[PDB]
A paper describes a structure:
The importin Kap114 transports H2A-H2B into the yeast nucleus, where RanGTP facilitates histone release. The mode of H2A-H2B recognition by Kap114/IMP9 is well understood: the superhelical Kap114 wraps around the H2A-H2B histone-fold domain, occluding the histone’s DNA-binding surfaces and functioning as a histone chaperone. Here, biochemical and structural analyses show that Kap114, H2A-H2B, and a Nap1 dimer (Nap12) associate in the absence and presence of RanGTP to form equimolar complexes.
We assembled the quaternary Kap114/Nap12/H2A-H2B/RanGTP complex and solved the cryo-EM structure to 2.9 Å resolution. The final cryo-EM map of the Kap114/Nap12/H2A-H2B/RanGTP complex is well-defined for Kap114 and RanGTP but the local resolution and map feature for Nap12 and H2A-H2B are poor. Local refinement produced a 4.0 Å map with improved map features. We named the quaternary assembly the Nap12•H2A-H2B•Kap114•RanGTP complex. In this assembly, RanGTP binds to the N-terminal HEAT repeats of Kap114 while the H2A-H2B domain is sequestered by Nap1 and the C-terminal HEAT repeats of Kap114. In the quaternary Nap12•H2A-H2B•Kap114•RanGTP complex, RanGTP binds to HEAT repeats h1–4, 8, and 12–14 of Kap114 in the same way as in the RanGTP•Kap114•H2A-H2B structure. The nuclear/quaternary Nap12•H2A-H2B•Kap114•RanGTP complex buries ∼1,900 Å2 of the H2A-H2B surface. Within this complex, Nap12 and Kap114 collectively shield the DNA binding interfaces of H2A-H2B, mirroring the arrangement observed in the cytosolic/ternary Nap12•H2A-H2B•Kap114 structure. However, Nap12 binding H2A-H2B alongside Kap114 in the nuclear/quaternary Nap12•H2A-H2B•Kap114•RanGTP complex shields the histone from aberrant aggregation with DNA while Nap12 and RanGTP work together to facilitate specific release of the histone from Kap114 to the tetrasome.
Numbering used by the authors:
A (entry chain E): 83 to 365
B (entry chain F): 81 to 365
C (entry chain D): 10 to 179
D (entry chain A): 2 to 894, 934 to 942, 963 to 1004
E (entry chain B): 17 to 99
F (entry chain C): 38 to 126
Amino acid sequence: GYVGGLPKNVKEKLLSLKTLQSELFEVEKEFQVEMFELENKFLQKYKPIWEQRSRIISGQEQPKPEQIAKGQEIVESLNETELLVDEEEKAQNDSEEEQVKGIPSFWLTALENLPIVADTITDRDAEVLEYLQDIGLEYLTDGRPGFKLLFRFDSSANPFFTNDILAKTYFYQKELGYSGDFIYDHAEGAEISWKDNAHNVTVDLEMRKQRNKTTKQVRTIEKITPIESFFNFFDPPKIQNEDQDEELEEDLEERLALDYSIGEQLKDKLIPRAVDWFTGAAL
Amino acid sequence: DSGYVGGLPKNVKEKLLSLKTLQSELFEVEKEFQVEMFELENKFLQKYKPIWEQRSRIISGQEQPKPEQIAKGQEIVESLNETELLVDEEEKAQNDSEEEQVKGIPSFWLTALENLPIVADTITDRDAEVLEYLQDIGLEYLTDGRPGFKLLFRFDSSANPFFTNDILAKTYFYQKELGYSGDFIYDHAEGAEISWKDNAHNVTVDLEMRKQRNKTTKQVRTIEKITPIESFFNFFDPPKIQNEDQDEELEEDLEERLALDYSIGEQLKDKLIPRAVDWFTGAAL
Amino acid sequence: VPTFKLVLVGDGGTGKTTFVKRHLTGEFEKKYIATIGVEVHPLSFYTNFGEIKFDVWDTAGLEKFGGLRDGYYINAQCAIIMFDVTSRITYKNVPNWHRDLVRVCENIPIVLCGNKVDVKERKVKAKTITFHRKKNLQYYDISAKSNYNFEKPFLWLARKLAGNPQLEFV
Amino acid sequence: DINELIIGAQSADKHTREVAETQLLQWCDSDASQVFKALANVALQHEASLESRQFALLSLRKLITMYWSPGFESYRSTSNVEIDVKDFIREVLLKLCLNDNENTKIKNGASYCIVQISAVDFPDQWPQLLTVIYDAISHQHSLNAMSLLNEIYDDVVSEEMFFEGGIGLATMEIVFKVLNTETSTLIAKIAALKLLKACLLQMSSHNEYDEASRKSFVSQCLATSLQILGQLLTLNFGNVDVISQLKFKSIIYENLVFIKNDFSRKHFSSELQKQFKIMAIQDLENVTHINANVETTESEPLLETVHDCSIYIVEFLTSVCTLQFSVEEMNKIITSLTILCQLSSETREIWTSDFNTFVSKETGLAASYNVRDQANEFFTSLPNPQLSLIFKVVSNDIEHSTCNYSTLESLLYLLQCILLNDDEITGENIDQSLQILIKTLENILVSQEIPELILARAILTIPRVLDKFIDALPDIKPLTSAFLAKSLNLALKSDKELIKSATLIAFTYYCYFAELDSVLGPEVCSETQEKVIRIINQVSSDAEEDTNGALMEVLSQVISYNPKEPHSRKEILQAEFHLVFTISSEDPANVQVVVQSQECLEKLLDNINMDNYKNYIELCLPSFINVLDSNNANNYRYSPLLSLVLEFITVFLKKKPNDGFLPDEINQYLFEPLAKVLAFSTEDETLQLATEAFSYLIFNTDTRAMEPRLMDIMKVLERLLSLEVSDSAAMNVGPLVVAIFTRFSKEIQPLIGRILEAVVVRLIKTQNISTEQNLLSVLCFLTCNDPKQTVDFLSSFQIDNTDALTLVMRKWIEAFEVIRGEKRIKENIVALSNLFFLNDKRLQKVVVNGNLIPYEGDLIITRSMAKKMPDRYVQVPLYTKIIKLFVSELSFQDKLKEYIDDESVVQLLVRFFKEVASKDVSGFHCIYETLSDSERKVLSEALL
Amino acid sequence: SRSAKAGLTFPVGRVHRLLRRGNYAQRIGSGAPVYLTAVLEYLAAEILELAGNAARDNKKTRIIPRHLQLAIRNDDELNKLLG
Amino acid sequence: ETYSSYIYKVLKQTHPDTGISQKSMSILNSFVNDIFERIATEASKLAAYNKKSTISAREIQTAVRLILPGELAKHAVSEGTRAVTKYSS
Ligand SMILES: Nc1nc2c(ncn2[C@@H]2O[C@H](COP(=O)(O)OP(=O)(O)OP(=O)(O)O)[C@@H](O)[C@H]2O)c(=O)[nH]1
Ligand SMILES: [Mg+2]
């Protein structure tokens, strides 16, 4: 206020400061570009490890004795003596061990140990996610910035939907959000091709066979009613803001806050740290 | 669930051990990622230095705006809302001789700091007296030696009556290993010994002096007392550890002081200097 | 006895209520209580040629209290517009009050009074007082404490309404 | 239902009016639409009395603001007003406003409502309004529609919607079309010219830098308006409806002056200025000849309207007065003005009957403004080449009209207006014309046939002739002397008050353009003063309105010529004082008379000397005492002359106290009435002035002469502390108590309890802060005098039958937390030292509740909250709290005693602690045990 | 914090800084701001109390500036303090 | 200037049920700052009158007493003394 009330030397100097600030903003845009290049470069390194651990969890790949031992030193140093092997466990025969290829409910347990996302999981969701095979992440390079999440399910043995891979996308605004970071903007996701409404865990099913009292026709009814589930992660809030969606936009903003918290939790903790969360040591 | 963990077969147990190994390898990859980010951040600091230098010259009055920069500032003002900067007719009637009687921005860095939420609460009026002579705040990244970032506070010895140091600096250090989340974790900090002109001008202690014909010891002696006091310049000379006292007393000391010190340093380095103009005007809030 | 409706109108705080109160009882009043709505006070003057009587409608000068204010002007036969010489805003409010009076009753005689002249701090003077010269309405400088020009507005109005320029009060 | 409401709400009786209004607002809150529609029906029906219809429209206008749309700042909720009812009311209001059948009161009410509705709706939500208005104006020349549009322009149209909105271009097109139609009746052209005035008023808030969309529109509209006005001025209408022709001319010239003043020079070209100048002169001449038709008295307003139109014509000529005037058009102007500036028989009769109105108009304080004032403006404004020519014209016409007693007065007034112009009248033959002018003026003075007003105008205008031409007249001094003497002699011989007052004002002008003393010589100046005071005496018997102010101004001028002391004349000074006193006391409430009597009286007392002080005393003082006694009979109600009297009583007492004490005559005169004023009076200003006067009197009168009235100064102190006076009056005590202690230093001691009782009783009663320290400073001061005597009174004195120490010690030391100011604070330290060193057991042990003990809880205890959690305090003894306060300011500025033994607050109080330690160790140690460690240290380190 | 130590909610530091900006004295007593902070928190308490009183006089829980104004109306000494 | 959160706290402590608008906080804060400035100016007047030239509890109690009406002033002084005592303890 009184800074403006000061003589025009003050206004001209602070105008020069604002010009320099715009120059800082341009340089900071270029800084953001360079960084996004750098996280993309190191995400190309991140991806092999995540794929390898996912293949191990799904049972498509087996560990190696060197990996086993070096994990042994790592566990001994961590003090997490729960993972240690015992002679009683060694007594288990190969036939007993091979009854399950992958780790039973690995990702289920990891998400249950995860603070907030665990609340979204229902019993039917827990049953379904046993068919989850990977969680993948990607960066949006073309056009507007953002990042994408992906999940993999064994649709061949999955009795709930035919979707082999489901992808969820996150978005940021065009210019630099203040404080040098990006602020959220609306997200988009895929639609799940449920095999049937009974197996649709996002829906509760009612079966009715009726003879209409008015028209006296004979009909069989299949009825649908959506319910909350971990796959409400998909079908995200439609748009950031639109004229026809305002009444929806209330819940859209609320669910956007919740979904961005969930996605940030994923991106920071679960994908980079999955084993400790499964074992609960990350708690 | 310990019962479940015991229930896992042996085979799944070596699988989990290998998965822990994969997490560790990801930890080393994160270390390399952080190294690359630190190098590129230092490069961009080098890119930044001239524009901070130019705005510092403007702040001190050493440089005058040139009408291209004036016009660019005006058109930026037209964007958003900064109409405070639009020069009115009354000021154009003024002359440089009248205006240049005050050179630079009065208390630019003082108000910029006191606008910063966490840091302002530490600045007493006695501290604020020195900050009036603050004209520059620079950043330096400890690429050489132990990793960290160093904060620089500059003064004019011929102007300030408090100390003979033109530049006062604060240092932060990180550990050689990354944190669990992948971010850097801190090591004990260090601060410079300010070359105060006199103990009376010292701001971080309180003195008492007195003369006694001491009957108890048959001594006609003079006594001087020095007592450390709370002050922003206690931001320097951060605490250090002595093992026996470290276990009992300095455990709580590191629990409290280090957290506040690191938070203040992070707030300064990130929020303040990159938007020093906005923090000065409060637009960065 | 001829009786006339006089609507005393003018900005709030300016002296309308104490002026009527002193004409009614003779004693000044220091403190300010804002009038709400209107009070009607029947005045009287003893004159040559006989008797003059007024019903004075003292209106609230504050818009928050001017409930149904213009409805008080309906049968007004004369009016006084009072402003205050020490507060220029009350003088700039004058043309609006005059227009409101005219709109309801077009051609009644109006007298404009500058109250509280008995202070050295007057902020508007006869030089700035020009609304009269145009609209041709009489103007007096009065005060309620010192009773300067205390009866002249009523005297002028009674002369105008009775049509008897030799009328004078006793 | 609505009908009895609108009847009751009109009642004068407070009860019925209030109940009807409240029922109306309640009903409108319940269902707005029903009430709105009922009111619209009442306003619509012709069967209702016109008062009811006016009330309906005015109340509806009020109710709209609070129940029509939330766009209003007021919006009384529950406003069920559907688009159905709003459209019905929008219809009804236009049907009322535009109907020629309706009374103008109904049209005005309806327009007043339409203007309110337009406020929130005009350019966007009610588009039919302008369509109907423009249709009516353009196709029917409706006067009602033009008046409604004019109100809309006045109250709701704005700059943005005038220029960028559609309003401006549409209106200007409509107006120009209405003025261009030959068939349009004259009254319609007048209404369209008023609407043009409104459009020009909108356009005036413009600047050369602004948008071209505004700038080009303004330029084109001004060009077209000038063309149309120039074309209109060529029309003639003959004898029919001359009043409307005058109004038509009047509004045309009003528009022309607006365009001339409020717009750039490029919008109203110089050549157009010349053309309109010619037409303006011709219109002036024409308007003069209707003024001969005025003699028919066909309509009474004819003379009034002629003057009103001529005001605007002369104002336009004033605006273009920098244009060159040819000789014949100056002759036309002068002839026309001499016809116009001629006094009416009515004004002539009024001035002859009551000279006070003449004086008020001549001195410039009359409220009226007329064509003679505008002629003054015209001649005052001319530049030199025009002024030097007009002066020759008017002076020549004065010569030829000397035989006529009709036009000569007007010609003299015109010359007067010429001579008030600031420029120098210089020319080839002004010497000759000037000599003839002074000769004819002298003959006007000599002649016995001259009517009153011509003589008065000549008396008033000779000073102006001498003043303007003081360098051209070779013998200015004898001319001035002879003219002044002749005017004064005529005024003395005449029996007309008007000529006397004219001569007094002319004397004021001579005092303005000459130093009378130097030009006349001392004896002639003295005789002039004698004559002037005689005339003032004669005139003053019948002064009213501004005549007292004018007399006081001329008396001020007389006083300024008084000779110096070695030749000063006693009786003229007596006469001057008598006049200033008499004129002032004849009109005591007139503020101008009071202030001018102030300058006059200070001038008289400016020649004051100790060598002649007694004379002034004996001259003035009895009259002032008469004023005091005459206000005493009236109970000292506010009369500002009494105020000025008291002020100059004070300053008169301050003038010559070069002797150690003022002469006892002043005491003998003033003391009784002035005390009679401090007693038996109840007003802030009168007591304030009387107490400053009385305090100054005491401040310089002899104690030995004053000892007899010492009980009277006691009564003054007591009654000024008595609650009969307001606390505002009580605060003035300081100077008076200081004065009495100066002048009764030793005599006051026996009566200090009578001092103490009054000071304490006001103390405990008052909640005014600035008051109580003043009383407490005194109570401090008493103990600095002697704490023993003070306390003996304090212990003996009681309120509510309790010892005053129990009242005083607590309240004084409570307020010692807010007592401030070094000296005052020193007075406290000395006071406490006097107490502490008196050291009676009361001082050792009386509880002064010095320490707070806060009520529990960190919530903030409001006044209401204090009713259930009041704060609490600790009853520490007197010495405890006071020393805490001491050491506290030491902070802001017996083992210790052993080491102590080895003018300013700090120096002052340190000895006290040294003296305390030297005289009461046990108390000092006792207090030490109650002292805090930080205070103990500061006390220690200050002593060390 | 110093406000908590003083038993006050309102900022002692901001009060001290506002006092500093006026340069009202050459050296400042630590009692001045704390005391004043309490005084102004008291004024806030009284004004607010009357404001809630008015809000309920408006039959509701939510105060807006009109209701602050009626609060000032409800207590004449605030009426003369604030105008 | 912003005392918003502390205004909220005082409101709950004096009226837990009550709400308050941001503009109302701005107006209340304006009152607070104006009264602060008048009190501080009177305090500076006192500090100028006496060479002491130091502002502590005393001049503030004086300024509050002079400026605030009696019943407001008494409890304002009460709260000032309460806070000073609580701080000093
Ligand atoms: N000094 C002085 N005070 C005056 C004079 N006339 C009125 N006052 C004071 O001004 C106030 C009179 O205002 P009111 O008559 O109450 O107000 P109003 O003009 O009727 O306006 P509302 O009550 O708002 O309708 C009182 O405080 C009087 O003491 C005057 O001639 N001189
Ligand atoms: Mg009133």
